[PDB]
Point group: C3
Chain length 231, copies 3
Amino acid sequence: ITGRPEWIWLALGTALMGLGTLYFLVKGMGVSDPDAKKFYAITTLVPAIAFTMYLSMLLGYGLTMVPFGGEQNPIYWARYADWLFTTPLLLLDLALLVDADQGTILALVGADGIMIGTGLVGALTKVYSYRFVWWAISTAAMLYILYVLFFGFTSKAESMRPEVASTFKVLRNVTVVLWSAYPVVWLIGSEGAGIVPLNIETLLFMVLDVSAKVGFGLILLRSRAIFGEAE
Amino acid sequence: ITGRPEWIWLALGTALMGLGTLYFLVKGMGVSDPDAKKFYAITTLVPAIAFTMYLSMLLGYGLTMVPFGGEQNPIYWARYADWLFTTPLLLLDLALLVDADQGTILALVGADGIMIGTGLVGALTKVYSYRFVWWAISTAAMLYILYVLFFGFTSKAESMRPEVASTFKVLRNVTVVLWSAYPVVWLIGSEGAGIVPLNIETLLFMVLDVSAKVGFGLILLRSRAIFGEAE
Amino acid sequence: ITGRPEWIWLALGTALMGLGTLYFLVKGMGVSDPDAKKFYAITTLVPAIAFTMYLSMLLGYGLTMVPFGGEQNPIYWARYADWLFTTPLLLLDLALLVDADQGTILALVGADGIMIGTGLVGALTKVYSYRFVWWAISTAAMLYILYVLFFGFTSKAESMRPEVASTFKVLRNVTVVLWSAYPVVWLIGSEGAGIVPLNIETLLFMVLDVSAKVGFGLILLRSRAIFGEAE
Ligand SMILES: CC(C)CCC[C@@H](C)CCC[C@@H](C)CCC[C@@H](C)CCOC[C@@H](CO)OCC[C@H](C)CCC[C@H](C)CCC[C@H](C)CCCC(C)C
Ligand SMILES: CC(C)CCC[C@@H](C)CCC[C@@H](C)CCC[C@@H](C)CCOC[C@@H](CO)OCC[C@H](C)CCC[C@H](C)CCC[C@H](C)CCCC(C)C
Ligand SMILES: CC(C)CCC[C@@H](C)CCC[C@@H](C)CCC[C@@H](C)CCOC[C@@H](CO)OCC[C@H](C)CCC[C@H](C)CCC[C@H](C)CCCC(C)C
Ligand SMILES: *C/C=C(C)/C=C/C=C(C)/C=C/C1=C(C)CCCC1(C)C
Ligand SMILES: *C/C=C(C)/C=C/C=C(C)/C=C/C1=C(C)CCCC1(C)C
Ligand SMILES: *C/C=C(C)/C=C/C=C(C)/C=C/C1=C(C)CCCC1(C)C
Ligand SMILES: CCCCCCCCCCCCCCC
Ligand SMILES: CCCCCCCCCCCCCCC
Ligand SMILES: CCCCCCCCCCCCCCC
Ligand SMILES: CCCCCCCCCCCCCC
Ligand SMILES: CCCCCCCCCCCCCC
Ligand SMILES: CCCCCCCCCCCCCC
Ligand SMILES: CCCCCCCCCCCCC
Ligand SMILES: CCCCCCCCCCCCC
Ligand SMILES: CCCCCCCCCCCCC
Ligand SMILES: CCCCCCCCCCC
Ligand SMILES: CCCCCCCCCCC
Ligand SMILES: CCCCCCCCCCC
Ligand SMILES: CCCCCCCCCCC
Ligand SMILES: CCCCCCCCCC
Ligand SMILES: CCCCCCCCCC
Ligand SMILES: CCCCCCCCCC
Ligand SMILES: CCCCCCCCC
Ligand SMILES: CCCCCCCCC
Ligand SMILES: CCCCCCCCC
Ligand SMILES: CCCCCCCC
Ligand SMILES: CCCCCCCC
Ligand SMILES: CCCCCCCC
Ligand SMILES: CCCCCCCC
Ligand SMILES: CCCCCCCC
Ligand SMILES: CCCCCCCC
Ligand SMILES: CCCCCCCC
Ligand SMILES: CCCCCCCC
Ligand SMILES: CCCCCCCC
């Protein structure tokens, strides 16, 4: 395990996701409100899935070698397995907060699936120049998602409770900033142009992942917006 | 890319799915009705997914070699990745049109999953005679789906709005004819008996795919059946 | 096929799932009640999926070799493909019976996904001692599911119809006993410590699978709890 310099960040990531999972699990024990239960379920599952995939990367299972540029390049494929399930759960948290219509939710989840799926294909593609074609398609799917979060959701939040409108606005802003960093790190890291070494890349993704999951969850689950308006 | 004679049909397929995706995306921009949004979301996602998988076939990612009959046989596995997601979306379009009950929708999607999954296993099976066992099981799942579309849905459409009944009937008929061709092409093509060469097989699937997705979508999204009855 | 001593149990399993599938399919033909249709759909799909995966194991497709302990160890990976889809369907049968809230259903299905997914990783892991780390995480996800079935569902059933409360209690008890055997068989069988040989392991899983699917389904589909209260 320690044979890879990036192991320290995989281990820290595993620990922080594990701790985040346990914290949300305990916190949600005292919850009976049916609406709050939905948000706790979604939000606890996110770091639990990430915990398993960080562990698989730490132990070496979630790593494969991909030939491109005349080299055997270490590619952590387990990231995409994580993201396939956790990024639509994160979007679902946002969509339920603002009572999004079903068509909009399906558009978001579908675009998200395309985003992660094409990122996976790009990560595993052996023809170097083609990796960036997949990156571009994935990034276009991301831009669609960000567009919807701003010009379909923000003006939906404003007709809702003030506490859900303010909580949505904060989580929207956190999401757009954090999620936009992922394609940049991929592009300059070992999957793309290879300018930033894998150990630093792994650190960067770990900070983004913990912030986008445990950070996000801490903000959401401390808000009164997750509860039905009750006396 | 041009090293494979079937590349021209993969390229045309990619282009037509891409163009179809953009057309539906633009067309749905001016839509606020919650019901119509569902149909636009579902129907736009279908060629978008197909676009990505056609591209993966064009660039060579979605192709693998399978030993059977003492030969290395080129198998485009990306078709099944496409179909796994797009065929239940197509069925969902039909089921929502007639306000199908939840049990029926689950039966359809489940049978569809079995249909595509067993087709994938058959496509990748190395014992030649066993490929046709999987083809038979998949075809039985197809026949179940077609049965339900006729003797569970058609008589559901008739108690609904005339515009939804007439639109459903047309899309049902398009679906049954087009979908029934797929097992025949598989059986006589490079996956099955090998009587029709891969380049012609690829052409045939491209025509079926564009018709079943973009053709289907053009009929559906031009109907007033996708809108709630409103003043 | 007969080259593997466990083939007889794979063949019997295939037959019993096939027969169970046909029986439930015929039985549900005379059903119009929308609630009952949901239970028939879910419950018929379960042995149908299991039938396909038992067949893939019989024909040899669903088997791979995994190096650990200095040996090439036969691992039937198709079990996890089965279980990935059938265990959440089984939980859905239970959850719908007691009209579980959406948050609880998502927690169950999510924990179940983690349970099966980590079992799959453990089954395919090449570092022997690490296989048991994945077994432990999977078992913890199982224990969460069993906890919810007892201390979240049982007291939900009691405020419902007596026929649904009594049917739920029986199916809950069947589920907890049968499902708890699976991690034990894995641990002592060819995936784990290797004390019980593969042919006996295969027998054990076949008895558990038929009981947990066809047995379970026979109890559920003969109950009046699956019908809406109607005059
Ligand atoms: C509604 C939304 C969910 C829409 C989803 C959007 C989605 C369509 C976007 C594209 C997803 C698609 C790229 C998934 C591809 C998975 C694939 C990378 C798995 C690895 O297999 C690739 C090659 C080795 O590089 O296998 C070597 C050759 C092997 C023989 C491969 C044969 C097995 C195939 C992988 C079977 C395909 C199954 C499905 C792709 C399962 C989806 C997995 C998940 C990653 C989407
Ligand atoms: C409700 C509905 C959705 C019901 C669904 C119906 C469904 C059950 C029908 C059968 C689906 C099943 C056949 C999927 C099999 C996928 C498999 C072909 C992927 C390729 O792996 C096959 C071999 C190489 O040929 O791998 C070589 C050996 C490798 C070590 C394989 C180990 C990895 C396994 C593939 C893990 C299994 C994961 C699940 C099958 C994911 C499902 C993918 C999708 C195609 C259904
Ligand atoms: C809401 C709930 C559903 C939550 C779900 C919980 C879930 C997160 C729990 C963990 C699931 C995760 C372990 C699935 C891993 C599948 C993996 C074993 C498939 C086989 O690939 C493993 C190695 C060979 O051993 O591939 C060799 C290297 C290859 C290059 C691998 C590259 C292809 C990757 C497999 C692509 C990943 C796609 C997704 C994992 C699809 C999920 C399949 C299913 C088994 C969950
Ligand atoms: C918890 C994990 C999260 C929130 C991950 C988010 C990841 C993305 C938004 C990834 C986006 C990518 C692209 C837009 C193109 C390049 C490849 C990706 C997959 C890194
Ligand atoms: C957009 C793509 C569509 C609508 C594809 C539909 C495909 C089918 C109905 C495929 C059916 C098959 C069988 C019935 C058995 C042989 C294998 C298949 C998968 C080709
Ligand atoms: C129809 C099949 C059923 C109901 C299978 C149930 C399987 C399980 C509950 C498996 C559990 C496992 C663990 C808890 C850890 C070890 C690995 C598994 C996957 C066997
Ligand atoms: C969105 C953030 C992307 C920028 C990442 C900056 C990383 C700087 C680290 C120094 C680069 C290491 C190069 C020498 C090894
Ligand atoms: C459902 C349509 C299946 C029939 C396809 C007919 C294809 C005819 C093309 C000629 C066959 C090529 C054989 C000589 C290369
Ligand atoms: C939950 C049941 C696990 C116990 C399984 C008992 C199997 C006993 C069979 C005898 C073991 C075979 C060892 C000699 C080959
Ligand atoms: C490819 C995996 C996509 C599914 C991820 C799980 C999250 C799905 C959330 C469903 C949202 C509800 C839509 C109506
Ligand atoms: C194996 C992939 C199956 C899921 C495909 C995505 C479409 C699912 C549509 C869900 C229909 C709603 C059922 C209640
Ligand atoms: C990884 C596969 C998980 C999906 C299995 C299919 C069963 C899903 C049942 C959905 C229950 C409804 C939740 C709201
Ligand atoms: C186009 C929608 C406006 C809100 C999205 C902001 C786009 C940020 C760009 C992210 C950088 C990705 C490379
Ligand atoms: C049995 C349901 C009647 C409607 C379905 C028509 C079946 C068409 C056969 C398709 C050919 C597949 C090989
Ligand atoms: C902790 C919840 C109480 C009900 C679950 C009973 C646990 C049975 C243990 C199963 C054995 C697995 C190794
Ligand atoms: C070796 C790099 C070749 C450049 C490929 C860039 C493609 C980016 C596509 C953006 C439309
Ligand atoms: C393919 C990228 C699309 C980003 C711009 C959004 C187009 C308008 C969509 C309106 C729902
Ligand atoms: C080499 C071909 C052997 C014939 C197999 C046909 C099987 C079809 C099954 C239909 C019930
Ligand atoms: C070779 C076996 C080494 C023992 C590993 C047991 C790990 C079990 C983890 C339970 C917390
Ligand atoms: C509760 C702490 C969980 C941390 C387990 C994984 C950390 C890796 C240590 C090497
Ligand atoms: C908008 C046109 C999209 C076409 C891109 C793929 C066509 C392949 C050209 C070689
Ligand atoms: C209807 C009987 C189904 C049995 C088919 C599979 C049994 C395997 C026989 C070798
Ligand atoms: C993006 C950083 C999130 C910070 C989380 C802090 C949570 C405290 C309530
Ligand atoms: C099956 C062929 C479909 C033809 C689509 C034409 C759409 C015009 C409205
Ligand atoms: C766990 C054993 C189940 C027994 C099923 C018998 C069904 C008869 C109604
Ligand atoms: C990591 C366990 C958290 C302890 C409880 C925190 C207050 C709910
Ligand atoms: C008003 C919300 C500001 C949140 C910005 C957080 C940036 C990481
Ligand atoms: C809305 C601001 C987006 C900031 C992008 C930051 C990418 C590192
Ligand atoms: C391909 C872009 C379509 C242009 C608009 C068509 C009329 C909505
Ligand atoms: C009355 C609907 C006829 C549609 C037939 C289309 C055949 C491709
Ligand atoms: C309902 C008519 C079906 C026609 C099947 C055509 C197959 C090529
Ligand atoms: C296996 C076929 C079952 C025959 C009908 C049983 C009574 C519904
Ligand atoms: C009162 C329900 C008892 C069911 C026990 C079944 C054990 C296999
Ligand atoms: C509730 C009793 C569980 C019995 C476990 C049996 C495991 C073989």
